[PDB]
Paper text:
QPRTs have been shown to exist as dimers or hexamers2223242526272829. HsQPRT is regulated by the interaction between two dimeric subunits. which can adopt open and closed states.
nearly the same in both the apo form and the substrate complexes. conformation even though the apo form, which may hinder QA accessibility. that QA binds to hexameric apo HsQPRT with positive cooperativity.
Numbering used by the authors:
A (entry chain C), C (entry chain B), D (entry chain A), F (entry chain F): 1 to 289
B (entry chain D): 1 to 158, 166 to 191, 198 to 289
E (entry chain E): 1 to 158, 167 to 289
Write the structure that this text describes.
């Protein structure tokens, strides 16, 4: 919960190995920019030039540690950013400093952007007194999910149980191939041999209702209109009481009030990751000394 | 250059290693959802719900190929997409189709989204009467460059070693630095004197960063009059809105950051439609 | 649950990568024995010389497929093996068959041995009238996790709330790090508001009660003797019906009925993976000219 | 032979990549446990709750060194383990200690179980006055051979010719493929212009003699009963005194004295790796911060 | 051209990953040789027993650093070696020292044998008055590109290339280069292999920066390029194929700008090095 | 022996991984060259422009089999090549065929040059009435070791003595680390309970006689002039043991006959892999129907 203790969430080995691949991706051969740089001791200042939330310090750190550079932060992880802010200093050999600059900035930029979009969107949820949770989707970038998931958590959103946990989602496609929703749900509880929580993706009011009577614990109301969403939700908590309702599909920071309803527990926003602009950063080398 | 023959731009072996990496990332553990759906033959339709350019077919196929699934495309690669269009059909064992579903869609969503974004950058520069080429930057998602650069290519967007303004500060002076790269270029700048100096001891290109449109053409003018051999690039704060203001009589390339940093993904989905 | 339908659980790409690394581990140099054997087409019989459950056909297949060989099974995945049974036939070039013999047999032997031990434990507990569930532990051979999980499943063992990823496991060591159970459970609940499955591992009746009071959804009773376990479960279910009681530590196939009890939900057995002797299989050719 | 220089056998870079992959397998995603425990400096005690031999210090060390943790040993590698013995201390940040607990414990359990089984068998053949040597087999767990070979050696089992120097192993499948042992052994020697060591697996006294008259250097007497094993080895040693006699198949620690004999050189026991119970070890924190 | 800052060309993380697979390749199983030697602190001397250019220091250092050993270099990267020269000292446990020997000596041998041959050819072409660059090719050992590309660089050697087979597969020397600029967008340069002047003027017409004239004989090669550098001035012309240390003067000419030789990587003897333990603890 | 069936020695999964890494190294980024050629069914012919021995078909095939192309060979593996020779043709999509050109040619060139140099050295030493064997060494290119060791075998040099000869090598760096050849040879023997051959590497006549007195089976005479080698070798007969003599050190084709002597049993030439010029091959497209 506390934004700063969350650095402890990232597993050191797979994070080291994930930063290793990125470094390899970007310089596959001889680095001629080093020959201009020299290997003289140097320093750079990291300027944040965008409003938002700051997230991604552990990835930033690990990248420069791999190049045996050191980094000193003046804002914590989760600080509000007010443009043109000194956030950090980086020290090490010039050529290693400039090797790690792209990857590092690029990583911080998008991580912060997704924390920033997430923060905005939870401030919109409390704005309309809504007392459910804002969540992300699995609509992440192949190869980059550790970073994006961390951003959502920093900016206050939540990883869906999809990998924050494990709930056996049934998508319509599951429903289609299983032969209807009832079949797919006992096949969903066939496997897990305990009080499981099963969730169904539902595109229409009829689908939602069959799913609940089939005994699902969450109903996902996908790509509904606010007009038809709340009537659908109200019935399904007159159906069963423990059935949570989740809303995804076409939800944006502006029109999110329209989805915050008396009768929705969760809102998943695909744009937290698919549409979030990257925060603007730059690493300007200050002195050589 | 064919709207649809650039799928050949990808080396097959590196593609399968990239795909394989993505798939093991997604489902390390056992796949219980496979039991829900079973292994019966199946088909799904790829639907495009956004406007834009289509991009990333080769990654899409390599995913499903690695899973023993075949793919029929109904549009060329790089064709335009007007919403709720049927883009393709994917066939194979139900559980293998669902296994590839999100890596494929998330991949195709971001590739198209960048290509879409490039296309708008070149169409506004084409329409605002300007010669040259619109390029991307290196502001890419780590571990995802191959996808993102292919996406620029398909969208119509645009050597030696580049020298940003930190190699200059590190090597001491622009005059000493240009040398330093040539001893074995796009020098960066924040002033006019620095852009004139940039071409010395033999330099070949320039890149102006975070300049107002009004302040750049008097810089730009004096370079065809310095040594006409060097091109001039504009960079920084170029967006879809403010694109014509940065096009100039003496601006050869315009590389923007927001075609990859601020380019929303396109809405796709994949529905199964008949199952036996 | 349907035993041939269990093959569907192995993710194909990581199954292929796993098989590939085994073969590389086993023959990285020059294969001189191929000179003795030639490449002529051949056929071999798989013989089961041990009693138990057959488990591991998907690994066996994959191994021989990367060697361009073909397997026909006579028993389905999950069968009871009655010693000296002709279980399968393997067709391909002589040298490719012998190249896969060792990794294939060692894989099949170790998986089946785990399924044989699990099936015997599921039925020992069945036989005593216990409606709880036998599960396996996380005490697995590093690198062989996927095979060993699959073996448990073919034999009837269960899968835990973990792996599914919807459970924070606070062990004794976490308690001590956190200052005690009450603080430990609260930090665990604050990992994220919404995935409230906290299991607390406990070594005394008092420790279980505090965990139950602090809001623990499961209680792992560790290394209790049967005459300590049963009273402890009985009072916990008397005062905390919604908490689930899982017992582990010290359980064998011999004493397992002693550990069944009407208030034990899950018995997880380390021996299933840590002392499950491997079954005996062999693979012989029967024509080559 | 002396068990503490045995650690010198492990190649550092291969060992590190092995430990690196095991860790990645065990925690590929976010580590919510860490927030419960924090990152304060801690100390855990390694307890040995089972009788046997203690093998695996190099793997246990490498696991924790990659998590920037330290180990102090109180017992040398190889030393006998008397139940409930305090065998090591591990110092580090709390969450890093618990990140390594499971893999380190599971690795040490297996390696020690195998060394324990080897040592019990080595000693049973020494009390019985046998001049021969007990060995393991290639019947290891895939991807884990490095630990299991090491376990065998610390327990006192011997190396084969596939370990030191070369060997062509003509298994009974190779006899059938070449069509005859004379044809199989002479194909084997064709693998080099220099003197080879060729071992033929034999299932009967007939095949043993045919193997020896064929120029076999070693003879693996697979699965004889002791009534046939001793006349066979007595014949071989008399009339082919240069031939080495190895026995394997169906050997147990109980019947091992029946397979000893003055003309058996080596006894490869498969159970040493497929029916060797892991030792029970635990890692308990004993203060934090 | 820098002299000893060329160590900085090599990207550190790619380097340790590469050295890593070299060590896992050489030592898959158990290390029985360590029981002979032990782990006592010790010290070894690197000997150069061959004349030539010394190249490969970053690889040598990387290999032994991975084994927790230390290296002291007595000669800078790029020196000429005259034999029996004492070039370095390596420090660390006895078993870790010998663990790195075979992959350390092999890498150095190849790297410095290829720098040697680059120097020998750079000199020979210099002795013929020729003022253009001597480059290597891509006929490298597979998996070893980085080490060989660095070797040539230490030795003094040096866009999209349309080989003869892209002329055939496109269907004309002419259409290949314009389908080459097609999606290249002015971003990359175009070089084209040719076996006659017909072909050469075609590719220069169509705006190809460089012409490579493959397997011409020196009579034929020199009037070719004179004629060619005239019609289109800015087209740099390269000759290659069948070029050796000895016949290199016959391939140097007023109008050749680059000479690629495949001997420089496919026929570059390794240098003789050795690593002997001394004055032990 | 039979060079045609030594393809059997190559393990298929290791071959495939090796070939993948080379393909990865050769095409790191986009292949714009592929746009010029296209993906139409075409074919090329493989031209041996150089004389020698043909070796390396399995790596050639494997490369093009990874790329979805097929190879028909007109000469068997191991055949003396006469230049102006058409050796094979290859069919596939154009861009794929040209994607495999470079790596296939470089590999076949280097393998065949190593084999050609080995065949030369074997024939030359037969021509001098010498009956020892020519062998290669482990001076092999890292990452390429398999191809070089194979080529050696194809051309008739032993590359596998330390894989198959029951042989263990005691370098003179061991002798020094162990302090005297007396204990180097004793430690080398300690590791095995079976008799093994020990080869000691000597730089002088003193070192040689001490190694034979120590019990060495082979003595490697390293870097002797021919002038000092053969007196040294004749003298060791003083031992008269089945003590073999091996010569090594700068033995090239141009000086090999001077090292052939009646008291030299093995000659190992590092230049067969360090200084073996590569054969000239080209792969030219002809028709595109």
């Amino acid at each position: 919960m506390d934004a700063e203790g969350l650095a402890l969430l990232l597993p050191p080995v797979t994070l080291a190995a994930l930063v290793d691949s990125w470094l390899r991706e970007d310089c596959p051969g001889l680095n001629y920019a080093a020959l201009v740089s020299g290997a003289g001791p140097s320093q750079a200042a990291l300027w944040a030039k965008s409003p938002g939330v700051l997230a991604g310090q552990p990835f930033f750190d690990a990248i420069f540690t791999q190049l045996n550079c050191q980094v000193s932060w003046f804002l914590p992880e989760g600080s509000k950013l007010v443009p043109v802010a000194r956030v950090a200093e980086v020290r090490g050999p010039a050529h290693c400093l400039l090797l790690g600059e792209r990857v590092a900035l690029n990583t911080l930029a998008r991580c912060s952007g997704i924390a920033s979009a997430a923060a905005a969107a939870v401030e919109a949820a409390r704005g309309a007194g809504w007392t459910g949770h804002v969540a992300g989707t699995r609509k992440t970038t192949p190869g980059f999910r550790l970073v994006e998931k961390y951003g959502l958590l920093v900016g206050g959103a939540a990883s869906h149980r999809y990998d924050l946990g494990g709930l056996v989602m049934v998508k319509d496609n599951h429903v289609v191939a299983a032969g209807g929703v009832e079949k797919a749900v006992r096949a969903a509880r066939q496997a897990a041999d305990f009080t499981l929580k099963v969730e169904v993706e539902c595109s229409s009011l009829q689908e939602a209702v069959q799913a609940a009577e089939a005994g699902a614990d969450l109903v996902l109301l996908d790509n509904f209109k606010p007009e038809e969403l709340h009537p659908t939700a109200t019935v399904l908590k007159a159906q069963f009481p423990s059935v949570a309702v989740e809303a995804s599909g076409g939800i944006t920071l502006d029109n999110l009030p329209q989805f915050c309803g008396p009768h929705i527990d969760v809102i998943s926003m695909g744009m937290l990751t698919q549409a979030a602009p990257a925060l603007d950063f730059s690493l300007k080398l200050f002195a050589k000394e």
